[PDB]
Structure 1
Amino acid sequence: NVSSGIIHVSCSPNNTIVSASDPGGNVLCWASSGTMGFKGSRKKTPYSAGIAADKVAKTVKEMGMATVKLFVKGTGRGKDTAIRSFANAGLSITEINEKTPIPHNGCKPPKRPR
């Protein structure tokens, strides 16, 4: 029910999530690799993120979606496939930005696995 908006995607090293939102901060709909049939370790693939982004773009099309900001989050090899999905979808993407939860050198993270 809104033309302008923002859709967020967070490509974790183990999974990915995409979520379309209005500029007021509320969510409209979200999608993830788990929403599709295949599960387990095979869900951390760029193809899975691509189909998730395809589905979220589809389900926001009926909403009447228009020019939209893009905040990409997380690290992984599947985030760019969502970019291809959205660009090829014909949507009115207008701005790209980086919103990884990057911290300054503060709290101590987990260790080296070894």
Structure 2
Amino acid sequence: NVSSGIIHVSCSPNNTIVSASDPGGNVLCWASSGTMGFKGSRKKTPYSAGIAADKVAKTVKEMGMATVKLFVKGTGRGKDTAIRSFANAGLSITEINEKTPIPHNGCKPPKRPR
């Protein structure tokens, strides 16, 4: 019932999440590779991210919005598959802002696996 909104596309290296939300807080729908039905390691493939983006795009288009600001987050692999899925869905993409957390040399990261 709202024309403009935000789409948070978080791409973890292990999984992906797409949350369609009102311009200020109050997420309106959400989807992820797990809710798609993919399980285990298949959740981290770009195709699963595209599937999740397509489902959420169809859902929110039937809900009836037009303009989307796409907030890209994380450092996965299928970071652009969701972008192309939304573009193919056809919602008016206005902004491509990226908001993956960057630190200013605070907090100690985990150990390096070997």
* Cα distance, 1:38 vs structure 2: 2.2
Deviations 1:61-90 (CA, angstroms, capped at 9, x unpaired): 111111111110000211100011011111
Find the residue that maps to 2:96 and give its secondary structure.
strand
Following superposition, which runs of at least 4 residues in structure 1 exceed 2 angstroms of deviation?
Answer: none
Deviations 1:75-112 (CA, angstroms, capped at 9, x unpaired): 02111000110111111111110100111101001010
| Sequence identity percentage | 100
Find the residue that maps to 1:34 and give its secondary structure.
helix
1:61 to 2:61 alignment: yes
Find the residue that maps to 1:7 and give its secondary structure.
strand
Find the residue that maps to 1:57 and give its secondary structure.
helix
CA distance in 2, matches of 1:36, 1:19: 14
Q: Is the 8 Å Cα contact of residues 38 and 48 (structure 2) preserved in structure 1?
A: no
Match of 1:32? 32
What is the TM-score normalised by the length of structure 2? 0.96
CA distance in 2, matches of 1:10, 1:66: 21
Find the residue that maps to 2:108 and give its secondary structure.
coil
What is the TM-score normalised by the length of structure 1? 0.96
Q: Superposition RMSD on alpha carbons, in Å?
A: 0.8
Gaps spanning 5+ residues in structure 2: where? none
* Cα distance, 1:24 vs structure 2: 2.2
Find the residue that maps to 2:102 and give its secondary structure.
coil
